[PDB]
Amino acid sequence: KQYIISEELISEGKWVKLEKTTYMDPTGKTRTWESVKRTTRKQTADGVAVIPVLQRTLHYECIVLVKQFRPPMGGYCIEFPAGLIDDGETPEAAALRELEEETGYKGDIAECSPAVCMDPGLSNCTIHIVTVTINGDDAENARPKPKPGDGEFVEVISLPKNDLLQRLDALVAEEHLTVDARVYSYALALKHAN
Amino acid sequence: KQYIISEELISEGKWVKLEKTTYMDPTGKTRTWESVKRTTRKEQTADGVAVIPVLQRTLHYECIVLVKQFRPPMGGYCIEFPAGLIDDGETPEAAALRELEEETGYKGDIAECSPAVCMDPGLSNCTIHIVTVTINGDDAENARPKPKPGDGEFVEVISLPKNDLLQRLDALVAEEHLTVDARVYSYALALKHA
């Protein structure tokens, strides 16, 4: 019943543009919306985010996260490892690549979401959420070698899965970090389950 | 180590702006970023709230109450937690219970309220509080709940059992063109993984 009529370019950078979207509301009334898009998409989605489950025998299972300075936020954020999918790369392959670059861990694919939206009231940005397990007992994950690209500066933060939400709250309380909403969503459901 | 040097406006809409952000990298080198911000944030501790609404009813499995709306940025229908912006002077908890009632009809009870968490920190400064609310579906207030959508809001309510949320979401994605929100998907995945 609702649909896009036209999109007016307002402003286009190298990485992001702003559009004025005209759409038909269900009553038959034309309306406008200010919409953001990335200029980099081809792809199933803009990006992947990786849920990396680090499994070591006789240890708690951990979720591997990354801490980085995020210029739009003006501060440091705690996030699932993540990056954009390369032209002609699959979401799975992007997940394992990003995970290795950002963490040095080598992982195995467990499952892969459909494209999911990041902030659909503002942008068209989408990602695949990719669950990956990491055999922390294998020699290739003993001393994980992180290969950052140009301009990535990533700290790795592993947190036990069974206390994830309490551990994150503690970091926010002590370290003036912002937690990512998808990380927080996942942590909450771990507590809310059953 | 890293910090913001300057923020130059590139383009300002009614609702959204684009900025050229200059910052210092941890090598001591100046770099830039293209940053999105909303124009509507005043003294709120965040832009908005998203509500995790746990519908509880005697001799029913708990349901997660979700909303389906057309999102102009996305050009299509999206399934999301009930959400909206925090009005000036409004508490995150008040915004949550208000938005929940407006979008679903349900009158909730506060359970917990997150710190401000980032929506897409590689792109925007946008933040929310994630507010968990329980709905006493045995109360007569919540028996045959009617939305009170504001102007240009057109919302369908979808309640899904917590104990099968991921499959039930997958089944809706299989049946029509719609996108699940990444925070919803993350929360459903944790429910499976716990």
Ligand SMILES: CCNCc1cn(C)nn1
């Ligand atoms: C470090 C390379 N710059 C990437 C980027 C992404 N956006 C939105 N602006 N700059």
Ligand SMILES: [Cl-]
């Ligand atoms: Cl798993």
Ligand SMILES: [Mg+2]
């Ligand atoms: Mg990244």
Ligand SMILES: [Mg+2]
């Ligand atoms: Mg990366």
Ligand SMILES: [Mg+2]
């Ligand atoms: Mg809303």
Ligand SMILES: [Mg+2]
């Ligand atoms: Mg609303």
